[PDB]
Amino acid sequence: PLMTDLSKKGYILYDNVVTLPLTTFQQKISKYFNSRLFGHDIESFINRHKKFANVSDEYLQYIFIEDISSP
Amino acid sequence: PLMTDLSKKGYILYDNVVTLPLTTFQQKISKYFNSRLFGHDIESFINRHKKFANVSDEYLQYIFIEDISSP
Amino acid sequence: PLMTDLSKKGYILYDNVVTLPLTTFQQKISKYFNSRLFGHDIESFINRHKKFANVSDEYLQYIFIEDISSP
Amino acid sequence: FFGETATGKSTTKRLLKSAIGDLFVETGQTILTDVLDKGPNPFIANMHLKRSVFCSELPDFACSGSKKIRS
Secondary structure (H helix, E strand, O other): OOHHHHHHOOOOOEOOEOOOEHHHHHHHHHHHOOOOOOHHHHHHHHHOOOOOOOOOOOEOOOOOOOOOOOO | OOHHHHOOOOOOOEOOEOOEEOHHHHHHOOOOOOOOOOOHHHHHHHOOOOOOOOOOOOEEOOOOOOOOOOO | OOHHHHHOOOOOOEOOEOOOOHHHHHHHHHOOOOOOOOHHHHHHHHHHHOOEOOOOOEOOOOOOHHHHOOO | OOOOOOOOHHHHHHHHHHHHOOOEEEOOOHHHHOOOOOOOOHHHHHOOOOOEEEOOOOOOOOOOOOOOOOO
16 A cells, blocks of 8 residues: 555556665665675675566665655 | 578587577576576586687577477 | 863764864874874774764764863 | 574474484584594594484575585
């Protein structure tokens, strides 16, 4: 039911998976915490489920609460 | 015996082997099977079949079963 | 209570935490100590005592005596 | 035994150990990674006349400094 706002972002729901760009993920994690000191643990965390679904597009199956909770 | 039509396909009888370039495999089959990360297992073998012809040209020894036999 | 007088001297009261610019302490310690000779020792003391207020700003949890005592 | 954490995999371990008695033994990570033909290796020594050996808590293999398992 939370389609509406995502449909306002131009994203398309494919296989009931919310498309989270990797660059947006890096931006939102860097907004709060430093990325240079947190590179190794983050890459180790993401290597478990990292795959090349597209030649240049990488979507993550994790939705941040701040992106869906109104202020 | 199939050199009559494979001559127009780019087959060249060099080193008694006629195969296909490696470039066309990424778009057809390797789209879901990335070779930049998980392909190393075959690359060690592939490097043993490459020849000193061109840096930007790749010559891989693999022929698709369905490319010859009509489905 | 005396922070405000120090506040006008380049210090910002952020969450009741004194913010010390790096260069102010660099120059103060380099006015007598050749930082080239003990660069490694000063660096070791720093990363053993460094505190991260945020991703960018770094502060030291000390107030120089001459900063409050009039000359 | 593949699955997510906290799925009760140790329940079968503790049930089987009690059911079997002395014939069950837990063995660390030496046997699948470390070389046993060189140096004193009692790991292969204690398995003699045993009916069950167990091995668990295998860490990440992509982490820096982690020794890849030799087959």
